[PDB]
Subunit: 163 residues, 2 copies
Amino acid sequence: MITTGKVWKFGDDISTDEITPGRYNLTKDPKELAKIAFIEVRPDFARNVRPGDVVVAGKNFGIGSSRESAALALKALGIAGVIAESFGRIFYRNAINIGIPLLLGKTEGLKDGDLVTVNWETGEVRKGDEILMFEPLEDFLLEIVREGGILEYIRRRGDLCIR
Amino acid sequence: MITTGKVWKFGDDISTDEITPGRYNLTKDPKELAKIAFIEVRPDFARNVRPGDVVVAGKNFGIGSSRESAALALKALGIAGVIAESFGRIFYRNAINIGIPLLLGKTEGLKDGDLVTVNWETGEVRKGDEILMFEPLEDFLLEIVREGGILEYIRRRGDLCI
């Protein structure tokens, strides 16, 4: 999976509460959630993000409460995936479950507004004439993302239909 | 004249009618045209294009109707320019007059979604660390484009005497 998009850059310790602050008390509605992703920390994000854009962050991206609405909001917006130095355990989980690709590594070389082409399988990020390498998700996880999330994964496989 | 953006690739014989359907020119608002650019052939283009992006096509880009709306729509969207193997004669003229730079050359090497930095004056297109060369508009034409089209060009360079 290779995508081309704009970098939306964030600092360290972005909490899931900052991803979906006000709307979010659970209204799973992907459409609605898309309207308030990063609504306070980055008011410009929600209305200007386009499919293929990438959320890039520093350390501990997605720490905090276990609200899956954060991952849902990003998915609803067509974000290509998330690149960070490290992720909050719960968010990482929710991103995979929802079907959002993730890359791990130093993000100091990526700035807000940068245009990049990301290969989510190899972790290769092309910026201008340079290439930044990140650790991609292992194959088992890419497979879950490829199917569109863990639920879709087991639905297609048939595990969901127990009887 | 250097821009960086994403390639939106199209094939051969793209008509101006495909760029802006004939049911949309009645407007003195280029922004309105921008909203319907390639609306029927590639619906996500108008909403997803960002200034600096480039339209790349095969041969005969811009044939068909002589209406300027096609070029107007692209410029309104902030499209950096058009790179094609060949252009419809009228579109070429309209592109210049409206104020959009053009590059001529083989485009098989550029794919939809490719990120490119384009030097519209030299024809140098940088894709990653790869360099593709195209034939640019000559300086006189680039000056008209650079100034914003033939009308703005004329306004700034006197000659306002018949």
